[model samples]
Target: FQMWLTKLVLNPASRAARRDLANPYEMHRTLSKAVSRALEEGRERLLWRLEPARGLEPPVVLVQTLTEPDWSVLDEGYAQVFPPKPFHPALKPGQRLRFRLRANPAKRLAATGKRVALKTPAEKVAWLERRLEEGGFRLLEGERGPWVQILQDTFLEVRRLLQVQAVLFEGRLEVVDPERALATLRRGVGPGKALGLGLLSVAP
Candidate 1:
């Protein structure tokens, strides 16, 4: 897979065209449209995460896909599309890395069989622990606290507004199964990936 870092300038015209700047779901759709045009021919599968933007600087998004994008299609507003880079990384059995992830932690309610977002620090921690277990990693104990934030997104297609109580996990983790760990890194963890919620970034 190839990863591209895209910088989007949200001026009045661009923002109006893309809808509200704070709505992640709108941003997802906007970016998906651009990706579809850029790819030209594909099944249209992409993973992306919008970096936290501050002040007047343009919002940045990291896009991962199988094919290179033709950035010329993004003429609605000023956009800077960096060259694609390889995303695959070699791994060993006993490798340890410091990881950071923003995810929408949620569970299904037994009675209603509906998915409900997980709230509270304890619940979020348990959610992270379970994800780590399934992803072939063990969270390092006594690490820094998990930062929590609420992110709201709107589904313009369905005209429904959704909210995600997101938890940001930043700490150390040891890989137990290299294959599973790699898969998790590539496929990401948790839901709401289209809205920039499940990108697991790690560093040695």
Candidate 2:
């Protein structure tokens, strides 16, 4: 799989005119359309994450896909498009790395078996701990930090608006199974992925 990192100048005026600014659903829809246009294919094959906006600047987005994109297609609204870069890196068992992720932490209801968002701080932290365990990594003792809720938006539909929330996590981890860890890194480890959640970034 090939991953592409794109820098988008969030034109507040243009986005506000298009009704996409601060709306994750609309933002996802717009980006998906751009991806479709860029690859000349359907958007279902695209996996993307919009990083948290930096102070007083446009946000950066990372997109992973199997096909190369036509950069020319993204020029209409964006101020600049940086050259894409390769994302795959070799890993070894027991490798230690610093990691950051934004994910939608949720749980299934024991009585109803329906998925529900994790509401409390303890619940959210427990969710992350469980995710790390299943993803072949262990949170370094004293290295885990508090989870912060970064984004929340309402999805408007014909009937009603549904609220969605996302949280950010950053810490150090020790890889146990290299293959499994890489798989988790590629596919991500949580819900609400399409709306910019669950992109794991790691560095040596």
Candidate 3:
């Protein structure tokens, strides 16, 4: 999964290089082939974990979901979430723009062995709103922090939607699972919550 993500994060430049060439068609074809190879390789690697339980130490389960309404009201009210900068040219003051949230459940675990959960959607939304409120806009600070927070909120929202019951295990204090738990916030679950974005299909 790390390799696949690395490719996602790194291979774009090469693709861009090809697209910059006089004949982009060849680059496009090559890019497609490369991507196919990456996918094939990724499947093979992932399956290695499933082969008679001879995989990762902690055991890994993949949960994926898409968000619908591809676009949501940015609520100028939420402007504080972003660093002060001109609004994205493509995004209008009160218009909705399409966006995607591809969440990986395996990535949302807390180190303490407890599975982070959320009980209700409203609770998750409130969590997100508060996160944005707290992390006011600072566009160039790089998105890793705030976005991760957003993803964490989405993670909780999913837990709620799926009616996930509990954390199942205790989290290790010293060996906290930063990969699974919220980065800039407490690691735990919210009870009986559901996402209130109107049962929209998550975009891919």
Candidate 4:
């Protein structure tokens, strides 16, 4: 199905905008307002994240949805939302793309069932490799070094009742199974999605 890619440029000057940027739950609530009907009807939920930024630059949010999104419901002067564009990727084995995905890398203990976060870079990258492989993709090594670098490791985000171990991964990948790779791209990888994590956005 063709999905919508919506970009919201937050007004760094707006108090509401700054608040949402600080807490993902608030941001999720704001975005949920846009697709409230779809959510009620059990249609596609939104996948989103604030693109990594530093300093005083306005925060940029990227949203993906199975159905088209309407941004009119947002608060006044909340953020400048660009038109949602529909897109569905064409796939083939061996195709390469640049990618970024924010994921929570962890394992549940068999004895205690407590989630344990992956600590080392090697552990994190290895964790990423397995997830990608399961989805029929292979992470390619960079021209100079490792294909995946820890753009953000150990980004602890808290919620009303939960905390997320979010890691932002950026790299290049090669498709092994086109169909599965497409599925992975759309469904995303790992957990903590509601907090705007694991929206795997890729490009040619």
Selected candidate, larger TM-score, 2 vs 3: 2
Misplaced by over 4 Å in model 2 are 16-18, 34-45, 110-113, 143-160
**Candidate 4 per-residue C-alpha lDDT over 1-204 given as tens digits, one digit per residue, 9 for 90 to 100:** 778899899997789888888788888888988888889998775899878887677788999988887799987898998999788788878999898988888888889978878888788889889999999899998576559877886566565457768898999889999989888877888888888888888899
Deviation of model 1 at 108, angstroms? 0.2
Query: Residue 25 of model 4: what lDDT?
Result: 86
lDDT for each residue of candidate 1 in 112-155, tens digit (9 for 90 to 100): 99878776767777888889879988776654554323333222
Q: Report the lDDT of model 4 for residue 41.
A: 96
RMSD of each candidate relative to the true structure: 4.2, 4.1, 20.2, 1.8
Model 2: per-residue Cα lDDT over 81-195, one tens digit each: 6666666747798888887787778877899997777777677777877898798877766545533333433222311154455677777788888878877876787877666
Model 2: residue 202 alpha-carbon error in angstroms: 1.4
Of candidates 3 and 1, the better by lDDT: 1
Candidate 4: the clashing residue pairs are none
- Winner by TM-score: 4
Residue 167 shift from truth in candidate 2, angstroms = 0.6
After aligning candidate 4 to the native by TM-score, how far in Å is the CA of 74 from where it should be? 0.4
- Candidate 2 residue 42 Cα shift, in angstroms, is 8.2
- Candidate 3, residue 20: lDDT: 20
Q: Write down the TM-score of every candidate.
A: 0.76, 0.77, 0.20, 0.93
- What's the best-to-worst order under lDDT? 4, 1, 2, 3
